[PDB]
């Protein structure tokens, strides 16, 4: 970012030395066609970084969701099988092993200590041997409860209600998995970046003829303007990106993992 | 801050005398500032704002929703309590407890303050002290409310649909929740109102520059204009930055609260 | 409107300015069009937004009232389907629904409901609901236990008591949203601040506009202005969308499709 | 295309006046520049993008509600070819009422006759109830519920099934609302006839500013842009009523049909 | 930048230059002529299509986005659909190979009806030829497909090994995939509406064929290359909706159906241990 608005302030001094040789020549660059070029491009600017910041709501908006629905399930554990102490601690385990797993594979880093801290070597092996663990986690824990069912201690409707909860879970985690997998058509978006990239470096030569000297900081404050336009849409189209911020997922882990044993009773030391 | 905004004002009118008296020294020296580019550049950050404040704006319309919702299912879950246990008005009772704690405690939550008080009028202290202990006070509420239904449902009291339709409105409560607590740790990211302030804040500062060469004595009066519709739109969606605040333009939580417990208390025959 | 008086004293600012355009330099005040081309057009920019922000709020008052109909239609549906021979149910469960929009009417009008109610619902009823502070949550609750009572006496199961009571639902987020948009508007801030701010501009800008247009200018600036008053003023337009204007929700006629419709289900 | 050529070409007319009245411009000391057309005419085309969007909005819905019909009315069907796989009386029955639906849905929006596609699909006793409402899509919508409430009554569907058959109608129910509610609300009028006016007055002063300019130009590059933004005007005119016969608008009869087809795919049966 | 696309934005902007050059050589024969173009004019109506723009292209992205949406449900709901066939049905492992097998086909069966190619082919390797003979006699085969999968559960009903609610536990997720087939059908049968395109793409057109005669009085011989990059903006901001004209297409752009109908189909074996 930088190196542009560096590259900026060079063909501006090149523009200016340049400049009056060429013009006699016959070769003019005024404000205003650059004006329109430029208005234009920022109008895509505004609506790309819409978009951009759509998908950052997006994935904003499914993580939210698994601690929602986490809360709900292990609530309605405790609230119909308030005993079943041992389904309780097992199911805990494998929403906290979701969400640990599902960070690990959008952030595409190793989720094997997450997996073996929380879970016994047998299912972290079925887990691991899966090319999509977190599903495989999903299924597990739905196989707690289907046993809970099959042994009598849950109804079809009470059944039904916990369910819909991993439904939830597999919604967040296919729209996590389409937000990770495939962004926005770039085909649009790399060819506005390019743009902006020409509009900014041409710049300094359309205005040098109304600024004289001072071209080199008016043009580096709106290279300025429209380059960080480009780039904040460039990081809020990756909320999963290999340079994204981790803090907000990782903190919402650990929220979840907390909530989840503070609420079992397992938080508060005896 | 309004403080902010008259401050910046000032400041532009002084950066303003500054340009008309500097305006002779600034042709020899070889400096031009025309006010072409500063259109260009000022329309661009005009199309940010307006984006920007949409967001801001969205975030706002988000948390009233939220809380309208605590309001609407909180009311028909003791509206199901009552139709369809019309006799058990200890449990009536109990639970509209928790509904209502539960609003506060939401209000406390977000407002990143104590809920004892509140609590200890509306429970017994030994539920105080189990809701206290949580990292999540408002989770535990919604806990010990399920419990009031899920031991109607082990004394038959309640069927397993029954139980159900009121479990679905302990969902959407979770939900609220979950809004809520998202809204509050998911800011509009700071790298755009910061680099959008500080850029109109420079736009602003250079702009009487630019006018001054066309204007002469009149850059101050056009320069103040323009600054303040700009310092004003930027302002604007920083001044809708944490809806659950405390502020003039900041949802009225405890009002809110107030008449959620009015609500409640009115469905079950309380004064 | 105000928008005719605004473009009059639009025309008396360009007269002045006109007359006063010779002092103009003699004062040393230099105008030119080019910033308030800049400026007009961010005030544009933000009046099509704030436009927006109006315009849905609108639209949603205009979905709250077209669930009612959805949502007591089909529970209507449902009592002559799964119940079809218990018409003096239908025709309780139906003066609730019925009694439930005309109260939300009055309730968002701010008007007694009280001739509704009580050509609707018996007298021992009427006086329960205008007791509370909350009147149509208070026939809502009623037509629930309608619904809750049929469910004890076996009439219902629990399946098809909760399919009603989905219903039920449908008209408490009815309830709650017309209460949040009545006493939620878009911030006023932005309509404050950019009412004055389209103001102060129409009025500065035939100033801007003499130098170029001259004896043209009253007629460009009218023009101009009238496009910037007449956005601003259609935000301050649709801002209450349930009152008594032109633009408004034609409530009691809404209410009356609302009842004939039920009437029309029901035989009566 | 009818009122916008008319305008158009008017435009070539009011571009020719400006050009033989610029004859008169020095005389009578009228400068008209570009500068101030360009402000008005920016601040107009961002007026009539946020319209279009919100004509757009409204025809996108339009077109989403239909599509819930087919969406409704297949997995009705489905449900009960899975449910009472043998019930075709029940099967011919609720299919006839539900294509009556679409059809008689349209035609409300259209304001048109349904009685002929009601007696081509039901018999003529229904026909008559039907008609005898002040709203016969919503009969339809309590006939078709009747015929499964009778599959209840009967013990054939249990209230679990029956619920999840009477889920579906209260799909239907939603179109039916939403629908309704985009015909008889259009977007207000404060906006459209004030915008409209103010695009036409534009477009007839525009090239008095730009003779100063063009000369012998300003009736092609006035013409020019008196296209895009009457385009932009009668187009957001167009599809705000989305049920509307203009061009633009949606096609119901084809989708109506599409829904006739796939209900009635192959004499209406069914592998068991 | 696919096909049909790239023809058009290279000839426009081979008809840019030489425009521009016509330009450059004949406008010293224009205050003679009375004919003169500026920059304002082109302004006004070049900032007037971005925004028109700047909107179209806005609901062809919304279209795109949709797309992608709908398939990732079909991956969303016929998992959990296997899951809950598992979970409830743990010992039905026959029962779990046919639905699987049905919900792959609909996959399968849902790529090939919106690039319309054959399905015959996937179908046999997936299905009994009685079934694929049921299927192609329909005139609407993938939904028809899911007719047969609730055929299969409702014989798990008849059978008593699913009470109502499990049954309907799964008969919603056949209608979360019935909402995706009506959504992708409507979206091959509901482009963005041709006028915005058509009128778009002519203005454009128009735009960019008389901007240089409007540009060369300020910029002389550098006339040719701002007029063409700004023609690049135009053009190719109108080319955008037609490149995401046709998201079930099989351009580059255009979205990976074989890989993700390849990719669901693995997620169910894997859950059914095959
Ligand atoms: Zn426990
Ligand atoms: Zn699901
Ligand atoms: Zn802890
Ligand atoms: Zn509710
Ligand atoms: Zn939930
Ligand atoms: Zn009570
Ligand atoms: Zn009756
Ligand atoms: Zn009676
Ligand atoms: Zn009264
Ligand atoms: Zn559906
Ligand atoms: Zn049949
Ligand atoms: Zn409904
Ligand atoms: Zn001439
Ligand atoms: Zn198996
Ligand atoms: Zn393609």
């Given at each position: 970012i930088i190196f542009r608005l560096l590259l900026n302030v060079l063909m501006s001094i090149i523009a200016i030395i340049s400049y009056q040789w060429y013009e006699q020549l016959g070769i003019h660059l005024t404000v205003a066609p650059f004006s329109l070029l430029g208005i234009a491009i920022a109008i895509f600017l505004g609506f790309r970084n819409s978009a951009s910041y759509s998908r950052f709501v997006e994935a904003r908006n499914l993580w939210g969701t698994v601690l929602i629905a986490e809360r709900t399930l292990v609530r309605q554990l405790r609230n119909?099988?308030?005993?079943?102490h041992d389904a309780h601690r097992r199911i805990v385990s494998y929403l906290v092993a979701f969400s640990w797993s599902l960070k690990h594979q959008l952030r595409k880093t190793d989720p094997t200590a997450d997996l073996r801290r929380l879970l016994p070597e047998e299912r972290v092996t079925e887990i691991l041997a899966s090319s999509m663990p977190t599903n495989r986690i999903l299924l597990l824990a739905g196989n707690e409860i289907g046993q809970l069912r099959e042994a009598g201690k849950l109804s079809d409707i009470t059944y039904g209600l916990m369910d819909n909860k991993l439904d939830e879970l597999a919604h967040v985690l296919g729209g996590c998995e389409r937000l990770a997998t495939t962004?926005?058509?770039?085909?649009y978006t790399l060819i506005l970046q390019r743009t902006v990239y020409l509009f900014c470096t041409l710049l300094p030569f359309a205005l040098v003829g109304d600024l004289h000297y001072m071209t080199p900081f008016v043009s580096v404050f709106i290279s300025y303007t429209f380059l960080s336009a480009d780039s904040l849409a460039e990081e809020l189209e990756?909320?999963?990106?290999?340079?994204?911020?981790?803090l907000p997922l990782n903190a919402m882990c650990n929220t979840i993992e907390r909530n989840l044993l503070d609420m079992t009773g397992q938080h508060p030391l005896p």
């Open positions: 119909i099988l308030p005993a079943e962004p926005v058509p770039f085909a990756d909320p999963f990106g290999t340079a994204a911020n981790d």
